[PDB]
Design a protein around this motif. Structure first.
Motif, PDB file in Angstrom:
ATOM      1  N   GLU A 198       0.817  -1.209   0.000  1.00  0.00           N
ATOM      2  CA  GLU A 198       0.000   0.000   0.000  1.00  0.00           C
ATOM      3  C   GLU A 198       0.854   1.262   0.000  1.00  0.00           C
ATOM      4  O   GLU A 198       0.435   2.288  -0.549  1.00  0.00           O
ATOM      5  CB  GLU A 198      -0.948  -0.003   1.198  1.00  0.00           C
ATOM      6  CG  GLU A 198      -2.222  -0.792   0.963  1.00  0.00           C
ATOM      7  CD  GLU A 198      -3.050  -0.225  -0.176  1.00  0.00           C
ATOM      8  OE1 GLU A 198      -3.020   1.009  -0.379  1.00  0.00           O
ATOM      9  OE2 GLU A 198      -3.725  -1.012  -0.872  1.00  0.00           O
ATOM     10  N   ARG A 201       1.850   1.774  -3.649  1.00  0.00           N
ATOM     11  CA  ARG A 201       0.710   2.284  -4.404  1.00  0.00           C
ATOM     12  C   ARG A 201       0.474   3.759  -4.109  1.00  0.00           C
ATOM     13  O   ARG A 201       0.085   4.525  -4.999  1.00  0.00           O
ATOM     14  CB  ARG A 201      -0.539   1.463  -4.087  1.00  0.00           C
ATOM     15  CG  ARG A 201      -0.404  -0.017  -4.399  1.00  0.00           C
ATOM     16  CD  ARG A 201      -1.691  -0.774  -4.107  1.00  0.00           C
ATOM     17  NE  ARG A 201      -2.792  -0.329  -4.952  1.00  0.00           N
ATOM     18  CZ  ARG A 201      -3.753   0.498  -4.563  1.00  0.00           C
ATOM     19  NH1 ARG A 201      -3.789   0.985  -3.333  1.00  0.00           N
ATOM     20  NH2 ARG A 201      -4.701   0.846  -5.428  1.00  0.00           N
ATOM     21  N   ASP A 213      -6.274  -2.086  -6.464  1.00  0.00           N
ATOM     22  CA  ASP A 213      -6.430  -2.153  -5.020  1.00  0.00           C
ATOM     23  C   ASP A 213      -6.229  -3.584  -4.523  1.00  0.00           C
ATOM     24  O   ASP A 213      -6.146  -4.537  -5.302  1.00  0.00           O
ATOM     25  CB  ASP A 213      -7.802  -1.629  -4.594  1.00  0.00           C
ATOM     26  CG  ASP A 213      -8.825  -2.737  -4.423  1.00  0.00           C
ATOM     27  OD1 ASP A 213      -9.362  -3.221  -5.440  1.00  0.00           O
ATOM     28  OD2 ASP A 213      -9.080  -3.134  -3.266  1.00  0.00           O
ATOM     29  N   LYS A 214      -6.165  -3.721  -3.193  1.00  0.00           N
ATOM     30  CA  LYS A 214      -5.833  -5.005  -2.578  1.00  0.00           C
ATOM     31  C   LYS A 214      -6.778  -6.112  -3.030  1.00  0.00           C
ATOM     32  O   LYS A 214      -6.348  -7.247  -3.265  1.00  0.00           O
ATOM     33  CB  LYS A 214      -5.853  -4.873  -1.055  1.00  0.00           C
TER      34      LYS A 214
END
Ligand SMILES: N#Cc1cc2c(Oc3ccc(F)cc3OCCn3ccc(=O)[nH]c3=O)cc(F)cn2c1
Ligand SMILES: [Mg+2]
Lengths: 539, 403
Positions: A198, A201, A213-214
């Protein structure tokens, strides 16, 4: 809020070249209406901007009918040659196993990186108006155009610059950059790994790069560049072979290329007989059908390779398959291969098993340095004494890295060895051969010190063939130990190269004769110099 | 302060692929290049630079610190030969005759001079990455790079003013510069020569490898001296004399061949007639004299042929025209277990000798397979320059005659 703007790469056209000027081909009324909508949103986003009538350059635009396609094929012909992005793809066997690995494909990647302002004039394109009663709306790109020659290379250089500080400050993570995707892997606990992902990102968002996204990030098993990457192993994607048609030359790429592709993990794959057929257009020799039968048996059970472990040694083992074919496995622990492969004999008139083994080692050596950065230890099917006799007496310089003998036949051996000094007690055969180029007629034979003689008449031959035939006659009609005197420099060059198989049928017969002898001493003398034994008169 | 420079007309910059390097060599190149960009010697470049020149790493003279070597051979050829103009450095003929010569690495001096802003794009090189996992680091040279042909020519102006005192202070010592190597010759004692070498070393520090040319020229052709001769002995002799008859005019083999009359066993002893013994003597004296009309032509290329003789021995000949050897020699020496390390040391020794005698490197003909030589020659290379070479794939019969 600070966006940390990306610095543009200075781009120029090729020297002595101008921008592209192409015709705006006619479009249907629906396609024109469809391109207006896209350009309005793209212009709102800033990816393009309307240009005035000053621009003298044009690249065509088409619709495929809700998708925009700008063909920069002419600008690509005229844009400068950019630095080559990494041509090769990473091999799975070189990857080191990590506790976790995350794939991040950057979306709208090229459009997120700007273009050099001085080059935006050449990206000009005109959308034709309806009924041709209005000047077409001209636009120019402000970001890396999809399909432009420099868009990939410029995007990669920009991505690498952004990633450098994060990588230096996060040593625990390992980042791999390949085209538009980034592959991150760490040995941390799964919680800290996902938190670090994260962070990266967020770093990319700081510079304006969109990431998944995750929940959107793909999870293993990854299907990537034809392979199948798993958390603990790797293999190629499932094999694809076209049965149709029963007679087809489409297998010039499908069957062999896929077997070539499977050869990196499937051991024992052969392609020689099947690749022979090629030799937009076929028969199958019975030897080629037996190859696929053994291939299909190898392709029957799925196999997987392991990932690289730097703490263990790197081993490579080669086997002789026959007909210039060689197969090798690279591993660190027994029965668990990192990868496999094959080596094909280079095309030549006279070759040697020892030579082919050396070329295979060099090939594997270069492949290993690419993949792992080191030379593997070799396990070779050749006796240590054979290699010493070969390398010490070979006229060329030869070297093989650290290796050990493995006794898995067929072992590579030296089939014959010439004496370095004349033999006492052995008959001395003076051989000679000659032919007439006009009639293709010639003679081959010998004379010896015991008074033994022979001359054989020959049809459809040359001087070089008669000189080889004369040696063959001396070998046939001589005891287990023989001295041979020739004037043929051509025949000496073949035998001093020490072949074990040849394309000429006559040389293979000479080889078969040498293998049966105990001691052979081959001597050379100049022709037509008055040496008493050289019976060129007999021809 | 920069000196202008541009490629020859009609030739683009170097676009040479970088070959794979081992992991230990990649680390060394990363540490070295990180310090160079901090010192301003090189700077990272973007994708607008399509040109590339290969780079590798070695260890010189059993020194632990790695050195960075760039194969500028393509760039040097595409660099203006006029970059040598004003003819670079002349070759001093007295350097080959000096009893002792010492070679020093003056490449660190080249880094103080800046390169032209336009030409920097052509000095681009790439540090490779293992398994293509990440794009390779690309730098370009801001300063003059070692191994380039222009770097000695540009610095030759400063080099003359730097060494002008030592020259005037020591007029008998000769000084020569080829690439990043400086060759200094003396006739004093080796220990005095080495201590006197530190005088030049101190001079270099203020402003900012022992060979001996006692080789004794082209080695003569020699025929055996025996009391008894076998048929095989005389057959080898006539073959060698017939070979040397291409190099020497007066060689005659008719009388020796007459002794071989009839079909005889190779190991049978043949007594020599007086006429044949005369012919052998007339041929010896012919071989004692030098080769006729052998001259060096600076426009032509030097060719070096090497033959593996076995047991660590290697023979070589340098020539521009066949059968007109400008120099012949034998290298007995290394690594007894490694043929390729021997050949690489042999190629370097020959190139060093060729720089002392003519001031230019020869094109080699190596008795080795291309794929075998290309795989291993970097692991044993200890020189700052690189010569050109090709690969002999057919066994030369002349191997015995040079032995
Ligand atoms: N799609 C795709 C994709 C992913 C990667 C890739 O990922 C890695 C990144 C960094 C690293 F230190 C190891 C990595 O993988 C090691 C092997 N591995 C693989 C899967 C898995 O679940 N576990 C596992 O250990 C590296 C690379 F060169 C190309 N790639 C393409
Ligand atoms: Mg003949």
């Amino acid at each position: 809020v600070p966006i940390s703007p990306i610095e543009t790469v200075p781009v120029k056209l090729k020297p002595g070249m101008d921008g592209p000027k192409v015709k705006q081909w006619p479009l249907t009324e629906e396609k024109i209406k469809a391109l207006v909508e896209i350009c309005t949103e793209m212009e709102k986003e800033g990816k393009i901007s309307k240009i005035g009538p000053e621009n003298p350059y044009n690249t065509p635009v088409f619709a495929i009918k809700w998708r925009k396609l700008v063909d920069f094929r002419e600008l690509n012909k005229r844009t400068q040659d950019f630095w080559e992005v990494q041509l090769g793809i990473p091999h799975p066997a070189g990857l080191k196993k990590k506790k976790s690995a995350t794939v991040l494909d950057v979306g709208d990647a090229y459009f997120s990186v700007p273009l050099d302002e001085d080059f935006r004039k050449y990206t000009a394109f005109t959308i034709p108006s309806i009924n041709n009663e209005t000047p077409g709306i001209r636009y120019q790109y402000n970001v890396l155009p999809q399909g432009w020659k420099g868009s990939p290379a410029i995007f990669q250089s920009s991505m690498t610059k952004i990633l450098e500080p994060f990588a230096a400050q996060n040593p625990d993570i390992v980042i791999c950059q390949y085209m538009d995707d980034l592959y991150v892997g760490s040995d941390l606990e799964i919680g800290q790994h996902r938190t670090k992902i994260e962070e990266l990102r967020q770093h990319l968002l700081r510079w304006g790069l969109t990431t998944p996204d995750k929940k959107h990030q793909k999870e293993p098993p990854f299907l990537w560049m034809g392979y199948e990457l798993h958390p603990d192993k790797w293999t190629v994607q499932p094999i694809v072979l076209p049965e149709k048609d029963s007679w087809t030359v489409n297998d010039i790429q499908k069957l062999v290329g896929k077997l070539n592709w499977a050869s990196q993990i499937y051991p024992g794959i052969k392609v020689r007989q099947l690749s022979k057929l090629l030799r937009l257009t076929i028969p199958l020799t019975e030897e080629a059908e037996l190859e696929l039968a053994e291939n299909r048996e190898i392709l029957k059970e799925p196999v997987h390779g392991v990932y690289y472990d730097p703490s263990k040694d790197l081993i490579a083992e080669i086997q002789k398959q026959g007909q210039g074919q060689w197969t090798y496995q690279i591993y660190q622990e027994p029965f668990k291969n990192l990868k496999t492969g094959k080596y094909a004999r280079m095309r030549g008139a006279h070759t040697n098993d020892v030579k082919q083994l050396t070329e295979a080692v060099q090939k594997i050596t270069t492949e290993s340095i690419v993949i792992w950065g080191k030379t593997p230890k070799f396990k070779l099917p050749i006796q240590k004494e054979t290699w010493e006799t070969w390398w010490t007496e070979y006229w060329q310089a030869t070297w093989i890295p650290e290796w050990e003998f493995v006794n898995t036949p067929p072992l590579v051996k030296l089939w014959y060895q010439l004496e370095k000094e004349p033999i006492v007690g052995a008959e001395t055969f003076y051989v000679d051969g000659a032919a007439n180029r006009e009639t293709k007629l010639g003679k081959a034979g010998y004379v010896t010190n015991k008074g033994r003689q022979k001359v054989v008449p020959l049809t459809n031959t040359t001087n070089q063939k008669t000189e080889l035939q004369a040696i063959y006659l001396a070998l046939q009609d001589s005891g287990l130990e023989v001295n041979i005197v020739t004037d043929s420099q051509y025949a000496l060059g073949i035998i001093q190269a020490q072949p074990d198989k040849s394309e000429s049928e006559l040389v293979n017969q000479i080889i078969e004769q040498l293998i049966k002898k105990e001691k052979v001493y081959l001597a050379w003398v100049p022709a037509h110099k008055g040496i008493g034994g050289n019976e060129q008169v007999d021809k | 302060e920069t000196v202008p420079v541009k490629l020859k007309p009609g030739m683009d910059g170097p676009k040479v692929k970088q070959w794979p390097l081992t992991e230990e060599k990649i680390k060394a190149l990363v540490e070295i290049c990180t310090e160079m960009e901090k010192e301003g010697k090189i700077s990272k470049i973007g994708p607008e630079n399509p040109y590339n020149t290969p780079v590798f790493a070695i260890k010189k003279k059993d020194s632990t610190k790695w050195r960075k070597l760039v194969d500028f051979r393509e760039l040097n050829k595409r660099t203006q030969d006029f970059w040598e103009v004003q003819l670079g450095i002349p070759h001093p003929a007295g350097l080959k005759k000096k009893k002792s010569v010492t070679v020093l690495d003056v490449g660190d001096a080249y880094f103080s001079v800046p390169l032209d802003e336009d030409f920097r794009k052509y000095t681009a090189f790439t540090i490779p990455s293992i398994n293509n996992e990440t794009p390779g680091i690309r730098y370009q040279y801001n300063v003059l790079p070692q191994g380039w042909k222009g770097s000695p020519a540009i610095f030759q102006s400063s080099m003359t003013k730097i060494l002008e005192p030592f020259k005037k202070q020591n007029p008998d010592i000769v000084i020569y510069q080829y690439m990043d190597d400086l060759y200094v010759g003396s006739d004093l004692e080796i220990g005095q020569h080495r201590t006197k070498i530190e005088e030049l070393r101190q001079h270099l520090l203020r402003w900012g490898y022992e060979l001996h040319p006692d080789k004794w020229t082209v080695q003569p052709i020699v025929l055996p001296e025996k009391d008894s001769w076998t048929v095989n002995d005389i057959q080898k002799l006539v073959g060698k004399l017939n070979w040397a008859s291409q190099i020497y005019p007066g060689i005659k083999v008719r009388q020796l061949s007459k002794l071989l009359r009839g079909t005889k066993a190779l190991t049978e002893v043949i007594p020599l007639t007086e006429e044949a013994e005369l012919e052998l003597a007339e041929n010896r004296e012919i071989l004692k004299e030098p080769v006729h009309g052998v001259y060096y032509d600076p426009s032509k290329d030097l060719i070096a042929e090497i033959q593996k003789q076995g047991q660590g021995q290697w023979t070589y000949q340098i020539y521009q025209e066949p059968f007109k050897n400008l120099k012949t020699g034998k290298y007995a020496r290394g690594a007894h277990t490694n043929d390729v390390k021997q050949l690489t040391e042999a190629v370097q020794k020959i190139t060093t000798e060729s720089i002392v005698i003519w001031g230019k490197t020869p094109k080699f003909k190596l008795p080795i397979q291309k794929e075998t030589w290309e795989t291993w020659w970097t692991e044993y290379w200890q020189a700052t320059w690189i010569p050109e070479w090709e690969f002999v794939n057919t066994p030369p019969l002349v191997k015995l005659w040079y032995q």
